[PDB]
Design a protein around this ligand. Structure first.
Ligand SMILES: CCCCCCCCCCCCCCCCCC(=O)OC[C@H](CO[C@@H]1O[C@H](CO[C@H]2O[C@H](CO)[C@H](O)[C@H](O)[C@H]2O)[C@H](O)[C@H](O)[C@H]1O)OC(=O)CCCCCCCCCCCCCCCCC
Ligand code: CLA
Ligand code: CLA
Ligand code: CLA
Ligand SMILES: C=Cc1c(C)c2cc3nc(c4c5[nH]c(cc6nc(cc1[nH]2)C(C)=C6CC)c(C)c5C(=O)[C@@H]4C(=O)OC)[C@@H](CCC(=O)OC/C=C(\C)CCC[C@H](C)CCC[C@H](C)CCCC(C)C)[C@@H]3C
Ligand SMILES: CC(C)=CCC/C(C)=C/CC/C(C)=C/CC/C(C)=C/CC/C(C)=C/CC/C(C)=C/CC/C(C)=C/CC/C(C)=C/CC/C(C)=C/CC1=CC(=O)C(C)=C(C)C1=O
Ligand SMILES: CCCCCCCCCCCCCCCCCC(=O)OC[C@H](CO[C@@H]1O[C@H](CO)[C@H](O)[C@H](O)[C@H]1O)OC(=O)CCCCCCCCCCCCCCCCC
Ligand SMILES: CCCCCCCCCCCCCCCC(=O)OC[C@H](CO[C@@H]1O[C@H](CS(=O)(=O)O)[C@@H](O)[C@H](O)[C@H]1O)OC(=O)CCCCCCCCCCCCCCC
Ligand SMILES: CCCCCCCCCCCCCCCC(=O)OC[C@H](CO[C@@H]1O[C@H](CS(=O)(=O)O)[C@@H](O)[C@H](O)[C@H]1O)OC(=O)CCCCCCCCCCCCCCC
Ligand SMILES: CCCCCCCCCCCCCCCC(=O)OC[C@H](COP(=O)(O)OC[C@@H](O)CO)OC(=O)CCCCCCCCCCCCCCC
Ligand SMILES: CC1=C(/C=C/C(C)=C/C=C/C(C)=C/C=C/C=C(C)/C=C/C=C(C)/C=C/C2=C(C)CCCC2(C)C)C(C)(C)CCC1
Ligand SMILES: [Fe+2]
Lengths: 333, 38, 53, 31, 328, 44, 32, 36, 66, 64, 34, 53, 38, 31
């Protein structure tokens, strides 16, 4: 248009094979480095000096067991920059101390910021409301709390999840054994939103496909399915039914997104070990009365079994020499 | 200045929204009562 | 030991928002705006016509 | 005392569900 | 010339003017589901502890016996019963019936019959209303998951004590014991189920935000936009081309599901197939076809075992297993 | 009662006679050539 | 050679993917 | 108890027979596209 | 067709370069990944873990030597 | 609208609604201060993170 | 000037020199050209 | 010895009638009948004009 | 029959009656709190 | 916590009195 800023603005918003925009200056390099850094780590970089594990394709791992493992516990919450005082420019030592994890997590953090900015930018360019950006704040809150806020409250980056399939599976059982994360009401609200979102996806797609009108042309001014028939069906099957199409689609937004946001609030509490581990009255009752036993008390026994049997190898920086007599067993109870 | 305020608006809450609110509050109480009591 | 403050948390945590929702709905019924099966506002402060007249 | 509160909460939830089903806003088709 | 009583009964049962449709499938659904509902409520509020293990150590599951809503459950049947049919009339006393976990069998069997009849009832109402009959196929996936978790896993393991308890903490206990014994996390079918549930939430939020974003202006300022849609209207309530252009520019030039029919088919199909596969994974793990075992997969030149993340997962599974196998 | 088969036989008889009363005034003797029978004699 | 966006972007993905694919293939011939 | 078994048996058989004889009562005709 | 004939030589060249990067052991030295014969040494039978933050570079060098 | 003693006093402070500097104004100076603020925030973060270790600065609890 | 401080200063200079300035110059060139 | 039941008697014995009075007044404001300075009902269900009008 | 009920009547509570009720409830709580607590 | 309840009740009564005085229904003379 007028100035040099206007030509750059016109070039970035030009209709090409992939939209760039101003957010693409932040999204495209950060997302490419995070994904490229993750693919580099699962292929070549080991976790031998941080976890005592082999976690790369070079060492014999497959796609399920390879991971970009977290830094060593001695690193603390260091940013672990390549030029930082830990690696001092040595990229080989940087890979061995787990600096690739902070590389993927930090560039991935600015990647999801750039993607949400991209959602805002395209919505303003097309001219629609920015509800996709609000819906993406759910995954942003989950990524920020789990991969950044939770290790920042813990001892080090070591206790964050590692970028891998089986490594994430360990992180699930770690938070169950150490925090009783299933008993947290914030995770329960998260399960309700995520399972409810899958229900809403299945039930809405089936209803539209089955209340279809006998005739989708892209420029169809009329609706392709009968809302009256769909409302009549679910009112007699379930008792209640949607009657507003706009409320039905806000609800499809709200339920899974609120599940991500509610579970993220509990992870923040888990960062400071403010966990919902026990019911004190039920724990006191089982102490005085050994015959007393509920499913919650049986679960706390399994949490003790998780903690003591993994701690020797899950946290190798600490020695944790546990003899067989102190290892909890249901047999010798 | 003790004049009729033009920004005054009526407030609505239809029966569906009332049922959603009652269900949300009752289910939240059901979920959090065990944690509050212990 | 019955936690005294926990009883108020369950009771007042349930009663107060239920009261707020019930009060909002009842005054909405008095204004004829407590149904979603009505047209949008024909004028500011004037609710639209119901679908069945 | 706690079990009474739990039972009251669950029964109240079921009452709310009953009212939401049978005393719902009747759907009217726009003319 | 008068109408027979059976004609009036058939007219009332299959009537579409009832507030809740009954139908012939509902003739099985309503008494079974109301039986299981009242029995579950009574057993949840007040029921004596059930000796699930079979060795005279009972587990309390009712509210009146000292547990809350989270820890409350209808405890599964005793290990002495196994997969034996245990109705209330085959027990010597009501006390012995409640001691052996009979309420679990009653509630589970009535609930299973009720949800199968619910599938049939969904088809039935779809038939009476003149619509396409595949909502019941979509509901067949959570029904399959419930069947695998309540009936089929006890069949494979040989005891209804191994079924999922009808409670919250009991569900978590079932999940932990199942992971310890079968490694469901490393099963490909549970991966397909997690992909289905995560993707279903993604696609639900995506579709909802896309429709909510492109709503056509019909209301005044700060008024609720939901009044812009009229129930029974013919015209579209949102701008489909604007949402398609946004979704196209979001990822790559032409990626929007331009045909809404296949978009909604994909929405209805993805989590249903995922839940089908995770139900079949749970059902196949009942017969000891466990998940992937990548234990001791990396060794050095001298034969020493280098652990992987699967080894740490196995250590967690072993801890849960040794705390579950009470004097094996 | 005693052998538990009379409960089975007795109940399906009672509902069976009600169904047979409905079936009596059904003009289904003639055979149709269609995917389903749309003929249902509703008395009232 | 140099398109405004396309040549640099698709080569930023294709060049490391083929190099990685050759590296993955060589790992299958390592005896451990 | 034998009486409870008798009552449950007759209730179950009653509802099953309702289902069975209802689906035999020309069910495919009970559809809105019925040809008169 | 001019770009196809240069892709017919560069794609095999890049695939061979990735193949030789692993088969010659250059991938182990570049990334610090231990070979199967150097997970443990004669003087170190335990898992080599970094115990200090700011001496991590020196600690890795006095432990991976030889 | 009501005129009060304090309202007449504060009247010139709210009398410049919509007044702008034409064009880009002082955006170039603002971007420099934003860039300097970003570098400053990274410095004090890396000092706290011990990614920058200064000469006589020890990030630990101090006495007196 | 400690090595960590010098490394930080080199990182800032490097980021401006090989990331911000080349991308901005390329953007200006392709915006005036196209 | 804080009497737990006595706290609920004071709280709920105050909250519930206050709620009932507040809910009654708010729906009265919506109907335009929340003032005593208005004429008697013109018709059944039709409140009279206010004195200021 | 589910006809429109002609006996339906609106309910009125002016601000003076609201203030009287609030004063009565608060004063009753003030008076009886000491006796309930002891 | 009894004194807290007593103080809350007395202050609430004074608040109700304040609202009844200054936010009363304005008396209008009929014409
Ligand atoms: C949402 C949209 C945004 C999306 C995210 C966008 C990407 C942003 C990326 C920024 C992330 C910054 C991480 C910085 C690492 C960190 O914090 O690093 C932590 C360091 C503190 O260092 C830690 O400090 C600890 C306390 O030590 C102190 O106490 C010890 C006593 O034993 C010793 O005396 C020690 O010498 C002394 O320093 C230990 O030493 C740990 O080992 C050491 O790691 O703080 C510091 O760098 C700075 C701390 C002050 C800033 C805090 C704000 C940022 C963190 C917010 C979360 C905090 C919440 C925590 C609860 C959860
Ligand atoms: C959008 C571009 C972008 C962004 C936001 C980041 C973000 C980040 N990078 Mg990544 N990087 C990028 C592009 C980007 N990178 C590209 C294209 C490459 C390839 C060359 C890299 C290669 C790279 C490596 C190898 C490393 C990082 C690291 C980092 C982190 C530390 C940077 C720092 O210390 O700031 C310092 C502060 C500044 C640079 C201020 C910016 C300059 C201001 C705006 C003006 C200066 C004015 C001043 C007066 C002169 C940070 C999260 C580290 C890492 O990820 O953590 C483990 C690290 O080791 N980057
Ligand atoms: C059954 C069930 C269900 C439905 C859930 C559901 C959930 N769990 Mg729980 N879980 C269960 C059982 C279940 N859980 C049991 C038995 C245990 C033990 C756990 C332990 C557990 C842990 C330890 C955690 C969860 C988390 C979650 C959430 C994951 C959300 C997500 O998609 O992250 C996926 C991540 C993202 C969407 C981030 C964005 C990723 C970007 C956008 C992808 C870019 C790709 C490129 C290439 C969700 C609420 C997490 C949490 O609670 O949420 C805060 C979490 O940390 N669960
Ligand atoms: C739709 C109605 C229905 C159905 C199908 C069932 C089903 C069942 N009930 Mg339930 N019941 C119902 C309504 C129903 N109930 C109602 C309304 C009440 C309240 C009075 C009860 C009260 C009740 C109690 C108290 C108990 C049951 C029990 C049972 C089980 C054994 C009953 C039996 O042996 O039948 C006998 C039926 C036959 C011998 C016929 C079988 C063959 C027919 C033709 C079906 C063929 C199917 C086959 C696949 C082909 C069975 C799973 C018991 C229990 O739940 O198990 C642990 C039990 O203790 N019922
Ligand atoms: C595990 C589950 C999961 C995954 C993998 C996922 C993935 C995705 N969702 C997206 C979108 C969305 N997801 C949404 C809601 C949801 N998403 C959910 C769950 C998921 N969503 C749930 C549960 C919801 C419900 C609230 C919405 C509303 C959107 C979108 O609008 C967006 C879209 O367009 O979808 C069509 C895309 C973001 C693209 C992007 O940022 O590119 C840029 C690339 C970046 C930023 C790189 C990220 C780097 C990450 C953070 C760290 C590195 C990770 C490694 C590369 C891989 C590690 C893998 C191991 C851990 C196993 C991507 C396909
Ligand atoms: C004695 C007793 C009772 C004992 C029981 C003990 C016990 C186990 C108690 C249960 C406790 C309990 C309820 C726990 C749950 C607590 C908990 C986790 C609460 C979550 C709270 C919360 C705030 C979570 C945040 C996430 C969130 C918002 C989740 C909400 C989930 C939710 C309600 C989803 C909707 C589910 C659902 C069934 C929707 C179907 C909608 C439907 C009918 C659509 C059909 C339809 C489709 C169409 O396409 C069209 C077109 C039309 C027209 C149409 O109609
Ligand atoms: C570092 C320096 C910080 C500078 C921050 C000021 C930049 C904001 C300039 C206005 C941007 C704006 O919102 O609209 C400018 C553009 C498109 O906006 C265009 O603006 C023109 C006026 O110049 C037109 O009149 C219209 O507004 C529109 O066509 O949208 C953006 O939001 C671009 C974001 C700028 C990204 C920062 C660049 C520095 C990195
Ligand atoms: C936006 C924020 C991102 C900023 C990241 C900037 C990248 C960076 O600092 O690299 C850090 C490296 C340190 O690694 C170095 O990299 C060098 C690789 S090379 O020789 O220059 O190819 C190597 O020689 C040297 O030993 C090593 O110290 O600094 C460089 O010298 C490499 C860049 C080349 C210098 C200009 C030519
Ligand atoms: C958990 C316990 C604590 C919470 C309490 C929850 C309530 C559970 C009570 C169980 C019984 C429920 C009674 C209400 C059902 C009913 O009568 O509907 C009345 C309607 C129409 O009634 C008919 O309707 C006719 C009018 S017309 O047909 O609609 O035109 C009319 O002529 C006739 O008089 C009338 O009978 O009939 C039907 O829809 C069939 C109902 C099938 C009965 C199962 C009820 C399922 C429970 C509902 C969900 C509960 C939550
Ligand atoms: C689960 C169980 C739920 C139970 C909830 C219980 C709700 C019960 C609440 C109702 C009682 C309160 C309603 C009063 C509301 C009220 O009083 O409104 C005043 C009302 C005004 O009458 P009008 O006919 O003018 O009112 C027109 C309408 O506006 C009234 O609705 O007159 C009366 O009701 C007559 C009784 C006079 C009563 C005077 C009492 C004042 C006593 C003094 C106060 C104490 C100060 C003491 C100082 C020493
Ligand atoms: C870290 C780092 C960095 C970065 C780097 C990068 C950026 C990289 C990239 C990388 C990359 C970028 C790579 C890639 C790779 C790829 C691959 C590896 C692929 C593979 C593939 C495959 C394997 C496939 C498969 C399949 C599927 C998936 C489906 C269908 C079937 C098939 C089979 C075909 C730097 C330098 C800055 C420095 C610092 C450090
Ligand atoms: Fe839709």
């Amino acid at each position: 248009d007028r100035g040099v800023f206007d030509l750059i603005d016109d070039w970035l918003k030009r209709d090409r094979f992939v939209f760039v925009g101003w957010s693409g200056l932040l999204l495209f390099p950060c997302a490419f480095l995070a994904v490229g850094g993750w693919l580099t780590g699962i292929t070549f970089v080991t976790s031998w000096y941080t976890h005592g594990l082999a976690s790369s394709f070079l060492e014999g791992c497959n796609f399920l067991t390879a991971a970009v493992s977290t830094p060593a516990n001695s690193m603390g919450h260091s940013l672990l920059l390549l030029w930082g005082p830990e690696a001092q420019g040595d990229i080989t030592r940087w890979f061995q101390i787990g600096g690739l994890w902070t590389f993927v997590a930090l560039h991935g953090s600015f990647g999801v910021i750039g993607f949400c900015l991209r959602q805002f930018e395209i919505a303003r360019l097309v001219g629609i409301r920015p509800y996709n950006a609000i819906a993406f704040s759910g995954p942003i809150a989950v990524f920020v709390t789990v991969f950044l806020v939770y290790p920042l409250g813990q001892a080090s980056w070591f206790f964050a999840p590692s970028f891998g399939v089986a490594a994430i599976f360990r992180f699930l059982l770690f938070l169950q054994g150490f925090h009783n994360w299933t008993l947290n009401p914030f995770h329960m609200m998260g399960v309700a939103g995520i399972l409810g979102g899958a229900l809403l996806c299945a039930i809405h797609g089936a209803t539209v496909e089955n209340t279809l009108f006998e005739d989708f042309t892209p420029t169809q001014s009329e609706e392709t399915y009968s809302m009256v028939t769909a409302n009549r069906f679910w009112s007699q099957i379930f008792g209640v039914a949607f009657s507003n199409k706009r409320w039905l689609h806000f609800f499809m937004l709200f339920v899974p997104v609120a599940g991500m946001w509610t579970s993220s609030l509990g992870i923040v509490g888990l960062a400071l070990n403010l966990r919902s581990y026990d019911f004190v009255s039920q724990e006191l009752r089982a102490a005085e009365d050994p015959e007393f036993e509920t499913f919650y008390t049986k679960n706390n026994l399994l949490n003790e079994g998780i903690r003591s049997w993994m701690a020797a190898q899950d946290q190798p920086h600490e020695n944790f020499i546990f003899p067989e007599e102190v290892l909890p067993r249901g047999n010798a109870l | 200045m003790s004049a009729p305020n033009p920004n005054k608006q009526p407030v609505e809450l239809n029966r569906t929204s009332l049922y959603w609110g009652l269900l949300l509050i009752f289910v939240l109480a059901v979920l959090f009562s065990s944690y509050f009591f212990n | 030991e019955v936690s005294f403050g926990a009883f108020l948390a369950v009771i007042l945590g349930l009663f107060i928002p239920v009261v707020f929702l019930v009060t909002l709905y009842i005054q909405s019924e008095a204004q004829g705006t407590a149904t979603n099966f009505r047209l949008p506002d024909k004028a500011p402060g004037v609710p639209g016509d119901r679908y069945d007249a | 005392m706690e079990a009474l509160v739990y039972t009251f909460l669950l029964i109240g939830t079921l009452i709310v569900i009953f009212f939401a089903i049978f005393f719902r806003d009747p759907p009217r088709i726009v003319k | 010339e008068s109408a027979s009583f059976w004609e009036q009964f058939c007219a009332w049962i299959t009537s579409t003017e009832n507030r809740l449709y009954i139908g012939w499938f509902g003739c099985l659904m309503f008494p079974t589901l109301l039986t299981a509902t009242s029995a579950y409520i009574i057993a949840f509020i007040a029921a004596p502890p059930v000796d699930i293990d079979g060795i005279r150590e009972p587990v309390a599951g009712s509210l009146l016996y000292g547990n809350n809503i989270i820890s409350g459950a209808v405890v599964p049947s005793s290990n002495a019963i196994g997969v034996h049919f245990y109705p209330i009339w085959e027990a010597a006393s009501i006390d012995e019936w409640l001691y052996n976990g009979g309420p679990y069998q009653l509630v589970v069997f009535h609930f299973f019959i009720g949800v199968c009849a619910y599938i049939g009832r969904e088809w039935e109402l779809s038939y009476r209303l003149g619509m396409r009959p595949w909502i019941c196929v979509a509901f067949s996936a959570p029904v399959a998951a419930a069947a695998a978790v309540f009936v089929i896993y006890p069949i494979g393991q040989g005891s209804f004590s191994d079924g999922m308890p009808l409670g919250i903490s009991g569900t978590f206990n079932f999940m932990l014991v199942f992971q310890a014994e079968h490694n469901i996390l490393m099963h490909p079918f549970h991966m397909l189920g997690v992909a289905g549930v995560f993707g279903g939430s993604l696609f639900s939020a995506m579709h909802g935000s896309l429709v909510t974003s492109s709503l056509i202006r019909e209301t005044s300022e700060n008024e609720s936009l939901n009044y812009g849609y009229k129930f029974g209207q013919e015209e579209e309530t949102y701008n489909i081309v604007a949402a398609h252009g946004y979704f196209g520019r979001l990822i790559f030039q032409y990626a929007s599901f331009n045909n809404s029919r296949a978009l909604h088919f994909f929405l209805g199909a993805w989590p249903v197939v995922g839940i089908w596969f995770t139900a079949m994974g749970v059902a196949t793990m009942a017969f000891n076809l466990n998940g992937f075992n990548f234990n001791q997969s990396v060794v050095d030149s001298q034969g020493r075992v280098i652990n992987t993340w699967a080894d740490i997962l196995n250590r967690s599974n072993l801890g849960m297993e040794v705390m579950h196998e009470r004097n094996a | 009662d005693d052998s538990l088969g009379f409960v089975l036989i007795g109940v399906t008889a009672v509902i069976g006679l009600a169904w047979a009363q409905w079936q009596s005034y059904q003009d289904d003797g003639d055979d149709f050539f269609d995917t389903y029978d749309s003929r249902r004699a509703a008395a009232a | 050679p140099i398109f405004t966006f396309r040549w640099l972007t698709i080569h930023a993905l294709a060049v490391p993917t083929v190099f990685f694919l050759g590296a993955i293939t060589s790992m299958q011939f390592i005896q451990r | 108890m034998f009486t409870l078994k008798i009552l449950v048996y007759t209730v179950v058989i009653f509802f099953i027979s309702l289902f069975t004889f209802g689906f035999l009562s020309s069910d495919p005709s009970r559809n809105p596209n019925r040809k008169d | 067709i001019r770009y196809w004939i240069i892709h017919s030589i560069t794609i095999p060249s890049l695939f061979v370069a990735g193949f030789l990067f692993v088969s010659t052991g250059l991938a182990y030295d570049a990334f610090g990944t231990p070979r199967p014969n150097e997970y443990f040494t004669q003087d170190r039978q335990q898992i080599p873990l970094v115990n200090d933050r700011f001496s991590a570079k020196q600690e890795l060098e006095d432990l991976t030597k030889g | 609208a009501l005129r009060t003693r304090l309202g007449e006093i504060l009247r010139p402070l709210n009398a410049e609604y919509g007044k702008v500097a034409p064009g880009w104004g002082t955006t170039s100076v603002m971007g420099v201060f934003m860039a300097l603020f970003l570098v400053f925030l990274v410095i004090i973060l890396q000092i706290y993170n011990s990614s920058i270790i200064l000469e006589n600065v020890d990030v630990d609890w101090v006495t007196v | 000037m400690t090595p960590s401080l010098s490394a930080f200063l080199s990182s800032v200079i490097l980021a401006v020199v090989i990331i911000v300035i080349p991308i901005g110059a390329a953007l200006v060139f392709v915006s005036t050209s196209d």
